């Protein structure tokens, strides 16, 4: 009965840029999801394919915890069936997702005077990501008929852009930390259970 190490995910001092989202595998442990659900710190707590009322009564083969920073008005893209720059090019949930999405405002940690440089997102991609796909490449995006030949400029775009979070931004443009919990059930022994 070791307790699941969710603190390492939720309380990490730095989070990943969404294009380079992080994942931690959680297994062989007991989780009290009510602590997360009841925390006043989280302004989003939305589950799909499972009801919150059941989280402490179920066992799963593995839980994955993916985490990253996006801007507030993009949190809505972290849900099945959604679209936009984040869902299309950065982090994509599947239609049949079973899991929960948890988010909170991180303006106090993730903005900087003069604009934070640390948090980037992919702005251009030739096709949409498949669910749970990850793209950390930085090839020049060729927007037109002229080959870019490894040089950024007209019609030749570097594909990642900084959010530039500044503490004075409006709330929709402020950083939010996001943790996505996936509940995986395989034909294998369950290892992560509620209490």
């Amino acid at each position: 009965t070791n307790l699941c190490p969710f603190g390492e995910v939720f309380n990490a001092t730095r989070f990943a840029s969404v294009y380079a989202w992080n994942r931690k595998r959680i297994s062989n442990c007991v989780a009290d999801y009510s602590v997360l659900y009841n925390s006043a710190s989280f302004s989003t707590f939305k589950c799909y394919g499972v009801s919150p009322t059941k989280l402490n009564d179920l066992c799963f083969t593995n839980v994955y915890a993916d985490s990253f920073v996006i801007r507030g008005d993009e949190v809505r893209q972290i849900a099945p069936g959604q679209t936009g720059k984040i869902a299309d090019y950065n982090y994509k949930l599947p239609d049949d997702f079973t899991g929960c999405v948890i988010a909170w405002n991180s303006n106090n940690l993730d903005s900087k005077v003069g604009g934070n440089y640390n948090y980037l997102y992919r702005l251009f991609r030739k096709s949409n990501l498949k669910p749970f796909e990850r793209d950390i490449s930085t090839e020049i995006y060729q927007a037109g008929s002229t080959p870019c030949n490894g040089v950024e400029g007209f019609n030749c775009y570097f594909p990642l852009q900084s959010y530039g979070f500044q503490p004075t931004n409006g709330v929709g443009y402020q950083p939010y930390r996001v943790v996505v919990l996936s509940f995986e059930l395989l034909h294998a022994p369950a290892t992560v259970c509620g209490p």
Partner: nanobody, 120 residues
Framework: QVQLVESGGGSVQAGGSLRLSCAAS????????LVWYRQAPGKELEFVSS??????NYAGSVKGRFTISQDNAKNTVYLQMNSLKPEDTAVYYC???????????????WGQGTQVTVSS
């Protein structure tokens, strides 16, 4: 336990040169890629150059003047900056995606920045 440490910034006269270094240390595994960016305060972070598995790219404004290279024997990438111009003044940052021992996931790390100031 991976860290990126920059070195090499400073003040130079227009036309001069500097060489920046971005050195990875700790429980490093494979580097998937590495990007040099620059930002002056309040301005949007700007792409400068990147390198991945030997392929390189550059901002149009620095192509021909700056060269990115991977050290043939060290966990370090250099940015050689020649023919410097006042417009090159900024804090330069490296960012890399690197897996750590025990993992196949390349995770993002950032250097601490180095000021470059070019005066006319």
């Amino acid at each position: 336990q991976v860290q990126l440490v920059e070195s090499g910034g400073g003040s130079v006269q227009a036309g001069g040169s500097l060489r920046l270094s971005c050195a990875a240390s700790g429980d490093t595994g494979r580097t998937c890629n590495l990007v040099w960016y620059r930002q002056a305060p309040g301005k949007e972070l700007e792409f400068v150059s990147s390198i991945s598995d030997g392929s390189t790219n550059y901002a149009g404004s620095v192509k021909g003047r700056f060269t990115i290279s991977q050290d043939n024997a060290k966990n370090t990438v250099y940015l050689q900056m020649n023919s410097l111009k006042p417009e090159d003044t900024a804090v330069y940052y490296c960012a890399a995606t690197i897996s750590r021992t025990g993992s196949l996931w390349c995770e993002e790390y950032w250097g601490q920045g180095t000021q470059v100031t070019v005066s006319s």
